[PDB]
Amino acid sequence: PAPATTFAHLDATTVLSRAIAELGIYPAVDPLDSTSRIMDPNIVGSEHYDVARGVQKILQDYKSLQDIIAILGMDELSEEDKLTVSRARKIQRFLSQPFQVAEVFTGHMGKLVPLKETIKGFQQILAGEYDHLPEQAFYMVGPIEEAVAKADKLA
Amino acid sequence: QMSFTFASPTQVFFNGANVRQVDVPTLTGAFGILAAHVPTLQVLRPGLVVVHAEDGTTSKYFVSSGSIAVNADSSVQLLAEEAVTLDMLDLGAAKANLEKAQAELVGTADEATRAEIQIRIEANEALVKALE
Amino acid sequence: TLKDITRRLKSIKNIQKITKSMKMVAAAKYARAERELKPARIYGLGSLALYEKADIKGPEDKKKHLLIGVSSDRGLCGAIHSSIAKQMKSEVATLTAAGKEVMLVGIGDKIRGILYRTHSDQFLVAFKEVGRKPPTFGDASVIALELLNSGYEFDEGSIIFNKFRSVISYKTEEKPIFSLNTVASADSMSIYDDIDADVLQNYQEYNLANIIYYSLKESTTSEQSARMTAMDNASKNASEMIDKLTLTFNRTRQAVITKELIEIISGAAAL
């Protein structure tokens, strides 16, 4: 009753989830449970809106595939389905970001990704422009430049 | 000295056995194969295949097509598409099929199907003669 | 929620017993898959023993190439169609690197669907209905017919299948397939007797059909075994999921009982 009553009082909610923090992702924001009253194409611009909705849609499709992937293996999916799974795992990793105040117990350097860099990076990941790098390249980076720099450092 | 391997897609009649002489109905004539035979490879036409064992007994199969191959090491491999022992057949069905094919031949006119018919006739003639 | 938990648990139980049934059926087909291999294995190897003994090496100076890949029409096999796909892709890459005009042929709906998108131009003919029934020589003869009656004289070729090694192990293998001119011009073929272009042509065609049959009889056994193992793993995965759901269900059941008790005692204690 307490948080379910608070929900109505807020203009923007960010719902951290334990199932995500236990994936190592941080911040543990749940991308499929956080909402905002300004996520509207007439406010944040049609480009930002389309990018956000595409990210949410692909993550929701991966969440739907979860049980098939868990039981009936990964190599029993459609090629399009494997594409969405790979892209969605990449997006999951990319949504994480190291914090300047979390560098005391992690060591990594805190990043501050401007809005344009985020929109561009997610445009590019949606468009499959990085289906060759391992998903591991996106975990705990700054903008997409650092993602590809790490992916090159992976060898 | 002769390592024989008579086989069919679904059955192995001989394998690495030691026979004395095998007679095959090659598409370019019949011929016999004993040890140390000159190396050759040939394709078969419907006919008997008599395999002579060392003791002297003879196993008389019938093969419709396939490939015989005798190699430098006196190792013979005979693969047959349909290798039936002679008992599983009969003269009446063969003769009737022969008549049907001859009739279709004297009825047909196109070279492709005419050749098909003549092949069927050859198989059936070889059948009737090979049985009895 | 107790009810939705029961719903999801029943769903997972359903697919779990489904995979159990399918695993036992796959094992029942692995029986008669391993039996009909031994005679067919002897037959195919007897076919190849010539090329092996005469030691033909094929030409490394020609371009027109044929790539046959054997698979089935049924999924759930595991890493079968993926393995054939990867081998065919790698070899298409390697060969087209040397400018060799490569054409493709796929025995099985799965491999054709997997390779058709990235490789559509490099493609002549595919085949279906393979996998439901244990393959027989009639099938291989039909395939050889279709391959010869294609207007494409391959100077070399290779078939790629899944050589069945054991109930747990299979190796994606690739057998070579020479053409008339290869065996003809092979100097080591000078010691073979009563040989001319016609006999060699007939023997070439018959060996093509033979090796296709051999690949089919190997791939079917490999696929049955792989499907058995994959369905076993899926059953164990669903069993673990069922244990998780049972834990959650017991938790929710306790919660519901406690909540209803609190409702009762609070509605009674207001008097």
From Swiss-Prot, chain A:
The modification N6-acetyllysine is found at K57, K111, K116, K153. The modification N6-succinyllysine is found at K153. It comes from the Eukaryota. Disulfide bonds: none annotated. The modification Phosphoserine is found at S46, S64. It is found in: Mitochondrion inner membrane. Catalytic subunit beta, of the mitochondrial membrane ATP synthase complex (F(1)F(0) ATP synthase or Complex V) that produces ATP from ADP in the presence of a proton gradient across the membrane which is generated by electron transport complexes of the respiratory chain. ATP synthase complex consist of a soluble F(1) head domain - the catalytic core - and a membrane F(1) domain - the membrane proton channel. These two domains are linked by a central stalk rotating inside the F(1) region and a stationary peripheral stalk. Homotrimer. Component of the ATP synthase complex composed at least of ATP5F1A/subunit alpha, ATP5F1B/subunit beta, ATP5MC1/subunit c (homooctomer), MT-ATP6/subunit a, MT-ATP8/subunit 8, ATP5ME/subunit e, ATP5MF/subunit f, ATP5MG/subunit g, ATP5MK/subunit k, ATP5MJ/subunit j, ATP5F1C/subunit gamma, ATP5F1D/subunit delta, ATP5F1E/subunit epsilon, ATP5PF/subunit F6, ATP5PB/subunit b, ATP5PD/subunit d, ATP5PO/subunit OSCP. Belongs to the ATPase alpha/beta chains family. It is linked to Hypermetabolism due to uncoupled mitochondrial oxidative phosphorylation 2: A disorder apparent in infancy and characterized by euthyroid hypermetabolism, failure to thrive despite excessive caloric intake, intermittent hyperthermia, and developmental delay. This is ATP synthase F(1) complex subunit beta, mitochondrial. It comes from Homo sapiens (Human). The gene is ATP5F1B.
Curated annotation (Swiss-Prot), chain B:
It comes from the Eukaryota. The chain holds residues 37 to 168 of 168 of the full protein. GO terms for molecular function: proton-transporting ATP synthase activity, rotational mechanism; structural molecule activity. This is ATP synthase F(1) complex subunit delta, mitochondrial. It is found in: Mitochondrion; Mitochondrion inner membrane. The modification N6-succinyllysine is found at K100, K129. Subunit delta, of the mitochondrial membrane ATP synthase complex (F(1)F(0) ATP synthase or Complex V) that produces ATP from ADP in the presence of a proton gradient across the membrane which is generated by electron transport complexes of the respiratory chain. ATP synthase complex consist of a soluble F(1) head domain - the catalytic core - and a membrane F(1) domain - the membrane proton channel. These two domains are linked by a central stalk rotating inside the F(1) region and a stationary peripheral stalk. Belongs to the ATPase epsilon chain family. The gene is ATP5F1D.
Curated annotation (Swiss-Prot), chain C:
The modification N6-acetyllysine is found at K13, K29, K89, K128, K171. This is ATP synthase F(1) complex subunit gamma, mitochondrial. SUPFAM superfamilies: ATP synthase (F1-ATPase), gamma subunit. CDD domains: F1-ATPase_gamma (cd12151). Belongs to the ATPase gamma chain family. One of its GO terms (molecular function) is proton-transporting ATP synthase activity, rotational mechanism. It is a peripheral membrane protein.
